[PDB]
Design a protein around this ligand. Structure first.
Ligand SMILES: Nc1ncnc2c1ncn2[C@@H]1O[C@H](COP(=O)(O)OP(=O)(O)OP(=O)(O)O)[C@@H](O)[C@H]1O
Ligand SMILES: Nc1ncnc2c1ncn2[C@@H]1O[C@H](COP(=O)(O)OP(=O)(O)O)[C@@H](O)[C@H]1O
Ligand SMILES: [Mg+2]
Ligand SMILES: [Mg+2]
Lengths: 542, 523
């Protein structure tokens, strides 16, 4: 009872020091706080030195008193893994937050482990066709690769990661894990309700036929829950990769919030801060997390991670550290999105390890490098285009500018998840079609077509049909005078006839606020507690 | 100086007591000689060790909770921020000059809470719920915590209901769902407050004709502003009768930075009464970029390490945990909602700043207000290309959704044929059509202050703009033409558009009929 039960020494926001009279717990062990309003779980971070451990709290620490009993569990935060977690939502510590009863755990796995060794590294490169033109052309994804979507607050990496879910997650036959780390709870609810009506999540007795498990540590959570929920997502994916042995998709929306939550709790751990304001241990924390999202000899994790960049700064150390861990970076730009080009992928900053002629073929590699050379020459020209206008260019330079504006518009593409707020239906573009289309624009076969026929079209057929649609209208502007449906008898009851079918509403003018209200009688004085804990009015001195 | 070599010094190891009973009989007369020099010892109360910079370090308080509202003997209230091994760090909700070393700190026994209920409606409170309008204490109310966690995934549903803001540019182009959060971002003096005020006045106008469960109860949180501006605003709300539905939380520029920091949380706690009881709330955190500055002051006075621009690093969490409470609840939680309108002031149009991009990553859309459009008289100065509300889209007025799609496409074409013409030297006469239709629609979209427009009279006006019926007025008299359209068209068609919601064929028949028999003043 006494030993292996420490007491809360001090509370500093999300950081709780616990004092153990004997038998201190190991670092990364989970501690339960007894007597709290909710389940407060403390993960041990440091051994402070005077029989004091220093812990990070997975919930809010409001209500923690400096004597509270803290019970060691002798093990880290351990979450339910297995096939029984499919079609469920879990929080960071593994509790089900979908109100679907408990989680049928095949095993209960610790969220902390080591990365798979160098002996267990799988080194095999195969393409993952997404149906996105700019991704499949200029920065093609790997089928067991780590994929980072770098974004600057509103440039569209959640729309892009949702399109990658829509396009990839059904053609892929294995399981899928979505880890929401520090994002909107509205987006988690939308993803849940649209994975139910897609049949990817099946509720009730058909739960075993679900293809996706959701782990959510969203941005209303304290900094201890956002710093560990990526590890819960990795544990759920790692059980499928290792024990079940099959191919997993791991979508992590904002892996930046892991780093930001560690830098929030890191100032209160008593560390000297590093660059811009960050924890000194940024690179090893991110490395220890990101080295576990790999494929092995036994399984495969295709990892898509949204990476927020803080003030549109790619030299900020959390994006600049994340860049080393990714096989394919898709860098999304703000200035591209302000040209209306969606997805706002920077074609001269998004790289891949698969843009290699020994991997994707010489034709694909050559059309990708040709597109990049045209766009780079346009970017080199834009400074003199802005001042001197286009009238001072050479004629091969005007050809460069015309073809580059054409392929800038042609990398734009409507999405099947943006069709709900744009009206345009979304186009999946196969790899051979986008290769042949960009090869044709590079050779010169479409110099007759205008710029805006390439904008937001799927194939190179659809730029031709959009020129057919744009051209035909170029005359169709008026001559819709009468012979309308807007007559006064053929479909038409009268206006005062139309008022007579308006239904009446009941207006009460009571505001209905005092219906179920228990009103606390506030005092005229500040009621305080005295030395004995009795609710006494505030005494009168100063 | 070991620890096991110090616990061995708990057991007695002297065996010679010629000084224990020498001083044990001389200690009590010594303590009784210096007795009036003792302050009485303090264990469950507190005593101020050191106060400064708005942070009191308090000895004692053995059983305070973290985040608990403590009370100084001056009457000024605090918050037990960090409980430490020997003291308690308290942030002082008020001026720290009335706190001295040696002052008794009394624990109130409750985590920081504000009065919420129906009786807080109509009232101007400070950042902690204490009323400043002078008309008494808050009756018919109950206290509730300011730092409650936002509802989870399973306690939410998608926004469906359309929450009309009364602004034509907003309700046409950037429509706002009922549980949405929409950012009003712009420079200084660009109409950021005016959009939120028009939303509040429009909710007063709509509450008189909805059946008591679609009523929206506003809360205005005025953080960091001048007190004269808040006084003029409360005067305006009482002059228009809107104060019957709104609360005015105000922590002004002279107030302490814990009060300016906490005022959005107290305002959101007051509005969460309406969210959690099936009613509907609207909350405007006016200049959340001043709440971030007050929190940066609090963090740098606690000597916490600064990060980007100087901000603590949990300045994202500061705004995220606040704005996440603006939800649309599920059917088994009442169906209530809370719409948030955070306001962020940028410097010289830089929206890639730190707090700006922090809140753009939290909210569901933005309302950009450009200073160039504002200086040219286009008011509300909505940057139509940059402002977005996709969650409010497919949750808006169906009659307005019919007309606003071609409005959006024509404004997109107008922006690009204005970017096409950096110069007046080459006319095309095919782009000149859309360049005059776009200057028609821009003049159509601008409206004047404190007069929000009902959604049917917005729908009819934009119907009369994107179609014909307005091509004879040049650019100048389109405000007068739109007023003539609203006044001269038979007012039954507004009732049909309101109750049917959309434009039926039998309705746009009478729309094309009634719009041709109005007399436009530019001829
Ligand atoms: N729709 C409008 N039509 C005409 N004038 C307007 C309109 N909206 C605002 N204004 C004028 O613009 C001025 C600034 O308005 P407002 O106070 O709403 O902007 P603001 O962003 O709050 O500026 P600040 O934040 O610096 O107070 C006001 O004096 C108001 O008269
Ligand atoms: N592919 C796209 N097509 C059209 N609009 C987009 C696209 N991607 C982003 N947007 C616009 O950008 C906004 C932000 O998208 P989101 O993915 O939520 O950004 P982030 O996650 O980077 O903050 C959306 O509301 C949408 O209006
Ligand atoms: Mg996002
Ligand atoms: Mg203002």
């Amino acid at each position: 009872p006494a030993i292996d039960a420490g007491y809360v020494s001090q509370v500093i926001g999300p950081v709780v020091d616990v004092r153990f009279d004997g038998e201190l717990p190991s670092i990364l062990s989970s501690l339960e706080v007894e007597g709290h309003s909710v389940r407060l779980v403390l993960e041990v971070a440091q051994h402070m030195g005077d029989n004091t451990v220093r812990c990070i709290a997975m919930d809010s620490t409001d209500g923690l008193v400096r004597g509270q009993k803290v019970v060691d569990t002798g093990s880290p935060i351990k979450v339910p893994v297995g096939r029984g977690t499919l079609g469920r939502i879990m929080n960071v510590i593994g509790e089900p937050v979908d109100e679907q009863g408990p989680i049928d755990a095949a095993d209960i796995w610790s969220i902390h482990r080591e990365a798979p060794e160098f002996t267990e590294q799988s080194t095999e490169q195969e393409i993952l066709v997404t149906g996105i033109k700019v991704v499949d052309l200029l920065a093609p994804y790997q089928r067991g690769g780590k994929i980072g979507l770098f974004g600057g607050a509103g440039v569209g990496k959640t729309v892009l990661i949702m399109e990658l879910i829509n396009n990839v997650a059904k053609a892929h036959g294995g399981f899928s894990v979505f880890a929401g780390v520090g994002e909107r709870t509205r987006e988690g609810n939308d993803l849940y309700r649209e994975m139910i009506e897609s049949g990817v999540i099946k509720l009730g007795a058909e739960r075993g036929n679900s293809k996706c498990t959701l782990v959510y540590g969203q941005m209303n959570e304290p900094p201890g829950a956002r710093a560990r929920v990526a590890l819960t997502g990795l544990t759920v994916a790692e059980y499928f990769r290792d024990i079940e042995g099959q191919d997993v998709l791991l979508f992590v929306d904002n892996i930046f919030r892991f780093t930001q939550a560690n830098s929030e709790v890191s100032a209160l751990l008593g560390r000297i801060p590093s660059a811009v304001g960050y924890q000194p241990t940024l690179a090893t924390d991110l490395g220890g997390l990101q080295e576990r999202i790999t494929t092995t000899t036994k399984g495969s994790i295709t990892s898509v991670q949204a990476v927020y960049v803080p003030a549109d700064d790619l030299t900020d150390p959390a994006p600049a550290t994340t860049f080393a861990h990714l096989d394919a970076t898709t860098v999304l730009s703000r200035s591209i999105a302000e040209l209306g080009i969606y997805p706002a992928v920077d074609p001269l900053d998004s790289t891949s390890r698969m843009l290699n002629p020994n991997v994707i073929g010489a034709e694909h590699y050559n059309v990708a490098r040709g597109v990049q050379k045209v766009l780079q020459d346009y970017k080199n020209l834009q400074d003199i285009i802005a001042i001197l206008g286009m009238d001072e260019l050479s004629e091969e330079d005007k050809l460069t500018v015309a073809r580059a504006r054409k392929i800038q518009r042609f990398l734009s593409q409507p999405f099947q998840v943006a069709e709900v707020f744009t009206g345009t239906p979304g186009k999946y573009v196969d790899l051979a079609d986008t290769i042949s289309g960009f090869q044709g624009v590079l050779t010169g076969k479409y110099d007759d077509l205008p710029e805006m026929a390439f904008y937001m079209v799927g194939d190179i057929k659809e730029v031709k049909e959009k020129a057919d649609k744009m051209a035909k209208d170029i005359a169709s502007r008026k001559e819709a005078d009468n012979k309308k449906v807007s007559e006064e008898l053929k479909d038409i009851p009268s206006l005062d006839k139309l008022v007579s079918e308006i239904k009446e509403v009941v207006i009460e003018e009571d505001d209905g606020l005092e219906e179920d209200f228990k009103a606390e009688a506030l005092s005229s004085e500040t009621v305080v507690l005295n030395e004995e804990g009795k609710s006494v009015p505030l005494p009168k001195k100063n | 100086a070991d620890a096991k070599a110090l616990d061995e010094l708990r057991k007695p190891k002297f065996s010679s007591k010629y000084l224990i009973q020498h001083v044990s009989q001389k200690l009590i007369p010594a303590v009784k000689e210096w007795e009036k020099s003792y302050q009485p010892p303090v264990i469950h109360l507190g005593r101020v060790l050191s106060v400064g910079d708005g942070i009191a370090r308090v000895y004692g308080l053995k059983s305070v909770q973290a985040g608990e509202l403590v009370c100084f003997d001056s009457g000024v209230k605090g918050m037990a921020l960090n409980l430490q091994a020997d003291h308690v760090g308290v942030v002082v909700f008020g001026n720290d000059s009335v706190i001295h070393q040696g002052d008794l700190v009394y624990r109130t026994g409750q985590i920081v809470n504000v009065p919420i209920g129906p009786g807080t409606l109509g009232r101007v409170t400070d950042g902690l719920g204490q009323p400043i309008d002078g008309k008494g204490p808050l009756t018919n109310v109950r206290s509730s915590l300011v730092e409650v966690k936002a509802p989870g995934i399973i306690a939410r549903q998608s926004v469906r209901e359309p929450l009309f803001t009364g602004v034509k540019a907003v309700d046409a182009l950037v429509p706002i769902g009922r549980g949405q959060r929409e950012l009003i971002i712009g420079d200084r003096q660009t109409g950021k407050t005016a959009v939120a005020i028009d939303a509040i006045i429009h909710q007063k106008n709509c509450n008189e004709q909805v059946p008591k469960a679609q009523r929206v109860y506003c809360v205005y949180v005025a953080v960091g502003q001048k007190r004269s501006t808040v006084a003029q605003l409360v005067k305006l709300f009482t002059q228009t009768g809107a104060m019957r539905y709104t609360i005015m939380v105000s922590a002004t520029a002279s107030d302490a930075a814990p009060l300016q920091f906490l005022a959005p949380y107290s305002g959101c706690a007051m509005a969460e009464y309406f969210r959690d009881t099936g009613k509907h709330g609207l909350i405007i955190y006016d200049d959340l970029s001043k709440q971030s500055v007050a929190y940066r002051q609090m963090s740098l006075l606690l000597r916490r390490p600064p990060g980007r621009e100087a901000f603590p690093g949990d300045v994202f969490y500061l705004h995220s945990r606040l704005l996440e409470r603006a939800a649309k609840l599920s059917k088994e939680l009442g169906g209530g909602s809370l719409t948030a309108f955070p306001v962020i002031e940028t410097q010289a149009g830089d929206v890639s700043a730190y707090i700006a991009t922090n809140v753009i990553s939290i909210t569901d859309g933005q309302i950009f207000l450009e200073t160039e459009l504002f200086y040219k008289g286009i008011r509300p100065a909505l940057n139509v290309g940059l402002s977005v509300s996709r969650v409010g889209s497919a949750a808006q007025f169906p009659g307005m959704k019919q007309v606003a799609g071609t409005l959006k496409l024509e404004l997109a074409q107008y922006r690009e044929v204005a970017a096409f013409a950096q110069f007046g030297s080459d006319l095309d006469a095919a782009t000149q059509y859309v360049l005059e239709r776009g200057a028609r629609l821009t003049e159509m979209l601008k409206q004047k202050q404190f007069a929000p427009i009902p959604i049917e009279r917005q729908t009819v006006a934009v119907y009369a703009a994107t179609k014909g019926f307005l091509d004879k007025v040049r650019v100048q008299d389109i405000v007068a033409a739109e007023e003539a359209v609203i006044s001269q068209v038979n007012p039954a068609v507004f009732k049909i558009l309101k109750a049917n919601g959309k434009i039926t064929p039998a309705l746009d028949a009478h729309l094309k009929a009634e719009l041709r028999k109005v007399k436009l003043p530019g001829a």
